[PDB]
Design a protein around this ligand. Structure first.
Ligand code: NAG
Ligand code: NAG
Ligand code: NAG
Length: 150
Protein backbone atom coordinates (compact mmCIF):
# COMPACT_ATOMS: atom_id res chain seq x y z
CA UNK A 1 0.00 0.00 0.00
CA UNK A 2 1.20 3.47 -0.89
CA UNK A 3 1.37 5.63 2.27
CA UNK A 4 0.29 9.25 2.78
CA UNK A 5 3.55 10.99 3.74
CA UNK A 6 3.18 13.81 6.35
CA UNK A 7 14.90 14.83 7.78
CA UNK A 8 17.26 16.75 10.13
CA UNK A 9 21.00 16.50 9.40
CA UNK A 10 22.81 13.48 10.72
CA UNK A 11 19.73 11.64 11.91
CA UNK A 12 20.66 8.33 10.22
CA UNK A 13 24.22 8.34 11.60
CA UNK A 14 25.11 5.07 13.24
CA UNK A 15 24.20 1.38 13.37
CA UNK A 16 20.70 0.19 12.37
CA UNK A 17 19.02 -3.21 11.89
CA UNK A 18 16.47 -3.53 9.19
CA UNK A 19 14.01 -5.94 10.87
CA UNK A 20 10.56 -5.19 9.27
CA UNK A 21 9.32 -4.65 5.75
CA UNK A 22 6.11 -4.56 3.69
CA UNK A 23 5.94 -6.65 1.65
CA UNK A 24 8.11 -9.09 3.48
CA UNK A 25 11.63 -9.61 1.98
CA UNK A 26 12.91 -11.95 4.70
CA UNK A 27 12.57 -15.21 2.68
CA UNK A 28 15.18 -13.87 0.26
CA UNK A 29 17.39 -12.06 2.85
CA UNK A 30 18.16 -11.86 6.59
CA UNK A 31 20.31 -10.39 9.28
CA UNK A 32 20.56 -6.83 7.76
CA UNK A 33 22.81 -4.45 9.65
CA UNK A 34 23.69 -1.02 8.41
CA UNK A 35 26.32 1.56 9.34
CA UNK A 36 25.92 5.08 8.12
CA UNK A 37 28.26 8.02 8.23
CA UNK A 38 27.31 11.56 7.53
CA UNK A 39 29.07 13.51 4.79
CA UNK A 40 27.45 16.93 5.25
CA UNK A 41 23.78 16.19 4.42
CA UNK A 42 24.53 12.81 2.73
CA UNK A 43 25.59 9.40 4.00
CA UNK A 44 27.88 6.68 2.97
CA UNK A 45 27.83 3.34 4.52
CA UNK A 46 28.06 -0.38 4.76
CA UNK A 47 25.29 -2.92 4.78
CA UNK A 48 25.89 -6.53 5.80
CA UNK A 49 23.38 -9.30 5.37
CA UNK A 50 22.90 -13.04 4.92
CA UNK A 51 21.93 -14.14 1.43
CA UNK A 52 20.84 -17.69 0.53
CA UNK A 53 23.16 -17.60 -2.46
CA UNK A 54 26.13 -15.48 -1.24
CA UNK A 55 26.09 -16.16 2.48
CA UNK A 56 27.22 -13.37 4.72
CA UNK A 57 28.06 -10.44 2.54
CA UNK A 58 28.66 -6.72 2.51
CA UNK A 59 27.80 -3.75 0.25
CA UNK A 60 29.07 -0.22 0.14
CA UNK A 61 26.29 2.35 -0.10
CA UNK A 62 25.60 6.04 -0.78
CA UNK A 63 22.54 8.01 0.40
CA UNK A 64 22.20 11.20 -1.55
CA UNK A 65 19.73 13.32 0.38
CA UNK A 66 17.38 15.95 -1.18
CA UNK A 67 14.73 17.35 1.17
CA UNK A 68 12.52 14.48 2.21
CA UNK A 69 13.57 12.09 -0.59
CA UNK A 70 16.79 10.24 -0.91
CA UNK A 71 18.50 8.04 -3.46
CA UNK A 72 20.05 4.88 -2.19
CA UNK A 73 22.77 3.37 -4.38
CA UNK A 74 24.76 0.16 -3.63
CA UNK A 75 27.93 -1.06 -5.12
CA UNK A 76 27.25 -4.51 -6.43
CA UNK A 77 23.53 -5.28 -6.38
CA UNK A 78 21.14 -2.70 -7.77
CA UNK A 79 17.86 -4.44 -6.73
CA UNK A 80 17.29 -1.99 -3.83
CA UNK A 81 18.50 1.10 -5.74
CA UNK A 82 15.72 3.75 -5.57
CA UNK A 83 14.48 7.05 -4.35
CA UNK A 84 13.18 6.59 -0.85
CA UNK A 85 10.95 8.91 1.08
CA UNK A 86 11.26 9.27 4.85
CA UNK A 87 7.98 8.40 6.44
CA UNK A 88 9.04 8.50 10.10
CA UNK A 89 12.21 9.18 12.01
CA UNK A 90 13.03 8.71 15.69
CA UNK A 91 15.84 8.24 18.27
CA UNK A 92 15.23 4.47 17.98
CA UNK A 93 13.88 3.84 14.43
CA UNK A 94 13.33 5.27 10.95
CA UNK A 95 10.86 4.34 8.23
CA UNK A 96 11.19 4.87 4.55
CA UNK A 97 9.28 3.92 1.44
CA UNK A 98 10.51 3.50 -2.14
CA UNK A 99 9.89 1.41 -5.27
CA UNK A 100 13.05 -0.51 -6.04
CA UNK A 101 13.25 -3.25 -8.78
CA UNK A 102 12.97 -5.82 -6.00
CA UNK A 103 9.54 -4.35 -5.12
CA UNK A 104 8.39 -2.09 -7.97
CA UNK A 105 4.90 -1.45 -6.48
CA UNK A 106 6.18 -0.17 -3.16
CA UNK A 107 8.54 -1.26 -0.35
CA UNK A 108 8.34 0.06 3.16
CA UNK A 109 11.36 -0.50 5.46
CA UNK A 110 11.73 -0.10 9.21
CA UNK A 111 15.27 0.22 10.72
CA UNK A 112 15.77 0.09 14.41
CA UNK A 113 18.60 0.95 16.80
CA UNK A 114 17.98 -2.34 18.64
CA UNK A 115 18.53 -5.82 17.17
CA UNK A 116 15.29 -7.15 18.80
CA UNK A 117 12.99 -4.13 19.16
CA UNK A 118 10.82 -4.36 22.26
CA UNK A 119 7.16 -3.30 23.04
CA UNK A 120 8.41 0.27 23.94
CA UNK A 121 9.56 0.71 20.30
CA UNK A 122 6.99 -1.42 18.54
CA UNK A 123 4.12 0.67 20.00
CA UNK A 124 5.71 3.86 18.60
CA UNK A 125 6.33 2.18 15.19
CA UNK A 126 2.66 1.16 14.97
CA UNK A 127 1.44 4.73 15.66
CA UNK A 128 3.94 6.10 13.21
CA UNK A 129 2.64 3.73 10.47
CA UNK A 130 -0.99 4.72 11.21
CA UNK A 131 -0.16 8.39 10.79
CA UNK A 132 0.94 7.60 7.21
CA UNK A 133 -1.92 5.25 6.39
CA UNK A 134 0.06 2.09 6.76
CA UNK A 135 -0.64 -0.78 9.06
CA UNK A 136 1.89 -2.85 11.09
CA UNK A 137 -0.10 -6.03 10.70
CA UNK A 138 0.73 -6.09 6.98
CA UNK A 139 4.49 -6.05 7.64
CA UNK A 140 6.74 -9.12 7.73
CA UNK A 141 9.68 -9.38 10.03
CA UNK A 142 13.12 -11.06 10.15
CA UNK A 143 12.21 -14.39 11.89
CA UNK A 144 15.86 -15.68 11.49
CA UNK A 145 17.12 -13.21 14.11
CA UNK A 146 16.70 -14.96 17.55
CA UNK A 147 14.84 -12.50 19.67
CA UNK A 148 13.18 -14.93 22.15
CA UNK A 149 14.09 -18.21 23.88
CA UNK A 150 12.68 -21.67 22.96
C1 NAG B 1 24.53 -11.58 11.38
O1 NAG B 1 25.16 -10.35 11.15
C2 NAG B 1 26.32 -10.05 11.96
C3 NAG B 1 26.93 -8.79 11.39
O2 NAG B 1 26.15 -7.74 11.92
C4 NAG B 1 27.38 -11.15 11.94
O3 NAG B 1 28.38 -10.76 12.88
C5 NAG B 1 26.77 -12.52 12.20
O4 NAG B 1 27.70 -13.47 11.70
C6 NAG B 1 25.52 -12.74 11.35
N1 NAG B 1 24.78 -13.94 11.67
C7 NAG B 1 24.36 -14.80 10.73
C8 NAG B 1 23.78 -16.10 11.25
O5 NAG B 1 24.40 -14.53 9.52
C1 NAG C 1 30.87 -4.01 -2.51
O1 NAG C 1 31.46 -3.24 -1.47
C2 NAG C 1 31.83 -4.00 -0.29
C3 NAG C 1 32.34 -3.11 0.85
O2 NAG C 1 33.43 -2.28 0.48
C4 NAG C 1 32.80 -5.08 -0.71
O3 NAG C 1 33.19 -5.71 0.51
C5 NAG C 1 32.00 -5.99 -1.63
O4 NAG C 1 32.62 -7.21 -1.96
C6 NAG C 1 31.71 -5.23 -2.92
N1 NAG C 1 31.19 -6.27 -3.81
C7 NAG C 1 31.83 -6.78 -4.88
C8 NAG C 1 31.12 -7.79 -5.74
O5 NAG C 1 32.95 -6.39 -5.19
C1 NAG D 1 8.95 -10.43 14.99
O1 NAG D 1 7.64 -10.20 15.50
C2 NAG D 1 7.32 -10.51 16.88
C3 NAG D 1 6.03 -9.76 17.18
O2 NAG D 1 5.29 -9.48 16.00
C4 NAG D 1 8.39 -10.11 17.89
O3 NAG D 1 7.97 -10.66 19.16
C5 NAG D 1 9.76 -10.56 17.36
O4 NAG D 1 10.84 -10.16 18.21
C6 NAG D 1 9.99 -9.92 15.99
N1 NAG D 1 11.32 -10.09 15.41
C7 NAG D 1 12.26 -9.15 15.21
C8 NAG D 1 11.83 -7.71 15.21
O5 NAG D 1 13.43 -9.50 15.02
Amino acid sequence: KEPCPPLTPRALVGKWYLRTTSPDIFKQVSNITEFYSAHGNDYYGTVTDYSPEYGLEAHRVNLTVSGRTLKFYMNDTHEYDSKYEILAVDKDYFIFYGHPPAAPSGLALIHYRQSCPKEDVIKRVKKALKNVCLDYKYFGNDTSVPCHYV
